Amino acid sequence: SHRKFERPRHGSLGFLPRKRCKRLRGKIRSFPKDDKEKPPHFTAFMGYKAGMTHIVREVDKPGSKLHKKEIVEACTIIECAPMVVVGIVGYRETPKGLRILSTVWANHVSDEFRRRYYKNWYKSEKKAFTKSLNVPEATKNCLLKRIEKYCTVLRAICHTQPSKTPLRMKKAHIMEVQINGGSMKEKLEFVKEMLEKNLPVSTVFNPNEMIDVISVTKGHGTKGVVSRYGVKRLPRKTHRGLRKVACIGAWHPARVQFQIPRHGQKGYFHRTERNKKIYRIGLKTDKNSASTDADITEKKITPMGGFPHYGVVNEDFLLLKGCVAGTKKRPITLRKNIVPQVSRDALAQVSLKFIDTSSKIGHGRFQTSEEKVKYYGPLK
Amino acid sequence: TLKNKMRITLSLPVGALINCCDNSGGKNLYIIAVQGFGSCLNRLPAASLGDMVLATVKKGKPDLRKKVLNAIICRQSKAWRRHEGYYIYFEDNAGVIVNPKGEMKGSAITGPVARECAELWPKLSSAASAIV
Amino acid sequence: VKTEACSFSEYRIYPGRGQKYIARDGKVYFYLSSKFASLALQKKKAAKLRWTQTWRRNNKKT
RNA sequence: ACGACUUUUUUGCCUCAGGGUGCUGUAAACAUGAAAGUAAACUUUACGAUCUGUUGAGGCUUAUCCCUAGUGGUAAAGUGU
């Protein structure tokens, strides 16, 4: 018979099987659609989650309850040292999907790129990527022409420079990035011109843009139904425990209904956050990078004593609105939105008033080393 | 009047006993229901500053007692985040009885009254000793 | 340059860290820290304690 | 859970140590210091919870904190194809 009272199910059914993600990297499932009209450009960028801060911003909205009154808002910081481009990929449309035609490589590549292809680079004689790097220019030309003739999609093979990060790992993270804008010939010229060079995040992305964020969530191990799926605990009375499962039910059908919530992995899931606004793009070159016009004292994004588990932010950085999936230290992939965004929030120009650099190692009672010296004065 | 309120923290489940804070002759207010509340098996209805409750009078003048009355929450103990950048809180919880279109039974709100509810309701701003 | 003081002390309070308590008489009291808040919550004479700036000033060590 | 996964194995890494950031709240010690009184001289000498000074002191702060190619380290030599 029908239930006594009506409520939807706990949790989405659309993320079953709620298993471990296959691959660590935040792989882009689909690219934004190409536009022939637009000039050739990169569609994505990988960066490392460094930590969180809050930022103070001046607001719009005539007719709002809060209105123009400046607000304090949470934000995430994503370290973004330049990626290096190493390959060109040509893909062709078939009824059975996209198929690779060929891949063309740069003449010179990083050791860190090769280090990823070896498992045990330390004990290896390191033969991989040493012969074919030296392939004739005539061969490169023939392959590019072959790609021009038949392919309808061009992707560029880019990789991180891991040595710029403070992380223990030295194996580079390698990724394909589709090229959007122009036709294939213009794309090929753009990639060829770019080839051996390094790509700043500021090349791809401008301040005020809306961005899609691709990352694997924070791992917690294999968890019970309450933790995994949020079901109400059984009453205090219960013989075999309050966190004992949901009742599966049904004598006919004679099987468990898969839609039941059940024990297994919590976290380590692949996730796309969509439409996150860029509040600021910082630059390593700027000596006043986390400073503002309102507060002009010397600040870089790195907190007082550095970030917990991350310390100094080494290079250029993205200050992104709110929460980002996965842990600090994790690679995070930024992608352009699938369709351009015409919303108020998308259009809006951020004017920041303040960026905190107080300690998050402690209870952040102080802001800078100079300020701490001035405050205390005498010491042993 | 624009009825916008912004998100203020959850507080005060039904059955709660709060101060009446005015010369109405009610001394306390016992909240029995919330106006505009959602629907859900798991939930119990809870109040906040911007929200219209329904109450009964346990302590106060005899005409007020046992009768059901509308009220507006004016002071609350539970902290909320103001967008000036601090978590604000009172010591105590208090509301004032009204009619269902928001006209005061009382006439002078003895404590201070939060700004987000005061600027919401004119008839409270008028009567309020201080705006918080 | 500045915004406001830290309430236990003169130095600048940064927005988003602090909390505010309004007392029964309607005076507002601004707290930087959970530690300062607990002393206030316990209703103690903070000026008695050695560490605090008021004590340091009172005992003429500023 | 265990497999599995992320890694690194000498332009590193580990180890401590130093420095940073903090967290706690003013250490021991000494005073020809004060202190409710006490006893013993005819205002000094014995005894005294305590408080103050030297003293934002002393402690603790990587394990899943930060920085430092600062110290000392950095092995088995095994197995499948």
Added chain:
RNA sequence: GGAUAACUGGCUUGUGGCUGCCAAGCGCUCCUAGCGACGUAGCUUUUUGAUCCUUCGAUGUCGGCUCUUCCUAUCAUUGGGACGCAGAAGUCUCAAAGUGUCGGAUUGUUCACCCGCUAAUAGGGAACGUGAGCUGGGUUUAGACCGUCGUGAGACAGGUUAGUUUUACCCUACUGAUGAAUUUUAUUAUAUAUAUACAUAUAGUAUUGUGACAGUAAUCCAACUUGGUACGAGAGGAUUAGUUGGUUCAGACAAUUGGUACAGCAAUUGGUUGACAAACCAGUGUUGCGAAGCUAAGUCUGUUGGAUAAUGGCUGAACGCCUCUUAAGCCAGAAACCAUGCUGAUUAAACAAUACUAUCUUUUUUGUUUGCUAAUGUAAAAGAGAAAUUAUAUAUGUACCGGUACAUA
């Protein structure tokens, strides 16, 4: 003992529930906007029977909780049609199950009966959903109580109080975790404007990926501005958008607030080490602060195309006129449907590209009539022969400028 009750199921569907057709009346006038008597036809098993086919060498006998899925006979939400639809209300209704369907009071209780919010607080299925999920309050063991009835023992689909709820370590299922192996198998191309399956394909690590197939998610409300306008005699009073907010569900995250302590400093009670510092002991002695890691009562984020349904139309016959088409031909049009998006993809015993590599590779000849150390298999050979193209109530060339002309099958 299912040769025979109480339970599901089953037949039947009287009874219950739901839909009809009719046309005497009602509906100011008016059979049918709304109704509908007196009749008559079905549908269902959401009631209870009738029943005794199944189970009596045991299918655990009510209710609640929890928890999920399915239906539509649609209560609200979307798009509409009709109206006795002035506006505002509101009613009958169609495509519709996309989405939602609450807080309590009283009860052993389904049901019931109120109060309050609300967008509406719809109706149902899943062994009367759900006892190796719980709970054990009720019916329904033995103690006891009162009433009635019984000479009595005792009885009472009379009331009442008290009364052990046993086992998963098996298989599957489902949730998560690993993982070889796979030539009767594959190939959507390969090669320098021309070729080519009667052809290719070792394997080993690793990276980039392909994406069949399977899954899927966002949701409702309020206010104001539109506008005190249209409409209305006045009283009143909007379909619509726009803007700002919030709810519900979801997915994260923890800067920052709160929550959290056998990281850690300080305090203190009793006892013990001569004092002293130092400490220890009381299954965490007990307090105050409490970074860190988790976390919400905290914070962020949560698409738009296609093809359509209902329905309105268009051209237009059948039928000189007419007709939205239950002729052809069309069109716009929904929270429905499929993509898009997003998740998985040892769900495809799937696959591509790239990098480096295993005494080793290539051609010819003879052979394949201690567990081993020369070594054999074909579900198809026997000429395994075969290049238009839209059609197919007409085509294809060729010449002219999709069209015209002239040929050819």
